[PDB]
């Protein structure tokens, strides 16, 4: 997993939120993206920003034009799947983007 | 007239607080679809102050 798309129609007829993580930087954009019909990575615009022994958790929530992101990284031992026990996520970012987000998709990478 | 300043006269749903929308897609105002071409009950959603 290396990114996400969020938007309405996902077809350049609107601003749409794109989020990408790579080894050099983490990058965010809201551009009027023409996404492809099968998004993955083979290894107008109005806002841009930059920065199984483990589980990465996130919450994305969008309120009054602000896109709020919370996260946690944790070691885990229950290799099967989504584990029991408890730990709370903490805020990373609060992004002024104004988009009417209603659909989303994750972005994968291949060797 | 300065026509370079514009506002949206038509949308099907009102903006939430700080919701933002530049999309210029032609507004179907009634029972006849636009198919991307202006006309009867099919109106350009932006307007100019002039
Ligand atoms: C937001 O997007 C949906 C389509 O995904 C649309 O029905 C709705 O009218 C839009 N606007 C608001 C104010 O939610």
Swiss-Prot record, chain A:
Effect listed in the UniProt record for changing residue 56 to K: Partial loss of biliverdin affinity
Recorded superkingdom: Viruses
Phenotypic consequence of residue 2 to I: In strain: A23.1
Residues linked to a glycan: 22, 44, 100
Disulfide linkage: 31-45
Function: Attaches the virion to the cell membrane by interacting with host receptor, initiating the infection. The major receptor is host ACE2. When S2/S2' has been cleaved, binding to the receptor triggers direct fusion at the cell membrane. When S2/S2' has not been cleaved, binding to the receptor results in internalization of the virus by endocytosis using host TFRC and GRM2 and leading to fusion of the virion membrane with the host endosomal membrane. Alternatively, may use NRP1/NRP2 and integrin as entry receptors.
Assembly and binders: Binds to host ACE2. RBD also interacts with the N-linked glycan on 'Asn-90' of ACE2. Cleavage of S generates a polybasic C-terminal sequence on S1 that binds to host Neuropilin-1 (NRP1) and Neuropilin-2 (NRP2) receptors. Interacts with host integrin alpha-5/beta-1 (ITGA5:ITGB1) and with ACE2 in complex with integrin alpha-5/beta-1 (ITGA5:ITGB1). May interact via cytoplasmic c-terminus with M protein. May interact (via N-terminus) with host bilirubin and biliverdin, thereby preventing antibody binding to the SARS-CoV-2 spike NTD via an allosteric mechanism.
Protein name: Spike protein S1
Organism of origin: Severe acute respiratory syndrome coronavirus 2 (2019-nCoV)
């Amino acid at each position: 997993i290396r990114g996400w798309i969020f938007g309405t129609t996902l077809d350049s007829k609107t601003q749409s939120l794109l989020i990408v993580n790579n080894a050099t930087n983490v990058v965010i954009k809201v551009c009027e993206f023409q996404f492809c019909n099968d998004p993955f990575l083979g290894v107008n615009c109005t806002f841009e920003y930059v920065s199984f022994k483990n589980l990465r958790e996130f919450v994305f929530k969008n309120i009054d034009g602000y896109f709020k992101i919370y996260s946690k990284h944790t070691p885990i031992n229950l290799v099967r799947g989504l584990p029991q026990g408890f730990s709370a996520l903490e805020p990373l970012v609060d992004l002024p983007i104004g988009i009417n987000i209603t659909r989303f998709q994750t972005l994968l990478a291949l060797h | 007239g300065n026509y370079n300043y514009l506002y949206r006269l038509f949308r099907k749903s009102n903006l939430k607080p700080f919701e933002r929308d530049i999309s210029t897609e032609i507004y179907q105002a009634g029972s006849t679809p636009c198919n991307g071409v202006k006309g009867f009950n099919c109106y350009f959603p932006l307007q100019s102050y002039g």
